[PDB]
Design a protein around this ligand. Structure first.
Ligand SMILES: O=P(O)(O)OC[C@H](O)CO
Ligand SMILES: [Ca+2]
Ligand SMILES: [Ca+2]
Lengths: 122, 122
């Protein structure tokens, strides 16, 4: 569920994701088009590609089972599909953390009309 | 160029293109994800697919050559890339016109977050 994802991002970055990530670049939030603007945006691009490989559950709205151990996310439960969604979310949160060093406030609300017309393929 | 597309939409539909189509459904305007919401939205999905296919010119920002003949759009010029973009735009404007019967106000400002997680393939 996207609000579980939010909690992962917030813990790993210390930022409010509704403000800092939900409108970032060409791929964060929305659906997305064009070329990722930077490494943070590429996290969202990959996250979008990850969700695309998922079939049989709703990655935005289905709750999955997760927990924390020493600051690491543990994806659990007895439902393989939902666990796959959890792993996508975990990977993106880790990516945001690992790329926080290049986060740019000028991309926080990047106008989607400025994204390139040719999208990068997964 | 998108301004030319806008003129085509206005002339084909009688609707103010920005108000009426720029935020419609899941695919009209910048990017898009999920399943098209209705026929009008599918026009935009087709238009997006059309733009993604063009290579060698910028479908959003390059002007193309066109004219009106007896009220019909005629795409012209000697640049095949730009003519391809013009044909994308003409086809979409005609599609909007042809689907006015099912155009719905309920989709005119449809929140992207409410689009399906699984996007339709081109
Ligand atoms: O919905 P948030 O607030 O977790 O942010 C959106 C993500 O960055 C993209 O799914
Ligand atoms: Ca996205
Ligand atoms: Ca679109």
């Amino acid at each position: 569920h996207l609000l579980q994802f939010r909690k992962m991002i917030k813990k790993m970055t210390g930022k409010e994701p509704v403000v800092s990530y939900a409108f970032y670049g060409c791929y964060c939030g929305s659906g997305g088009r064009g070329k990722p603007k930077d490494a943070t945006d590429r996290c969202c691009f990959v996250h979008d590609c990850c969700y695309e490989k998922v079939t049989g559950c709703d990655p935005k709205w289905d709750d999955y089972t997760y927990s924390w151990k020493d600051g690491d996310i543990v994806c659990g439960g007895d439902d393989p599909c939902k666990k796959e969604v959890c792993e996508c979310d975990k990977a993106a949160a880790i990516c945001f953390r690992d790329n926080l060093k290049t986060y740019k406030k000028r991309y926080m609300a990047y106008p989607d009309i400025l994204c390139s017309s040719k999208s990068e393929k997964c």
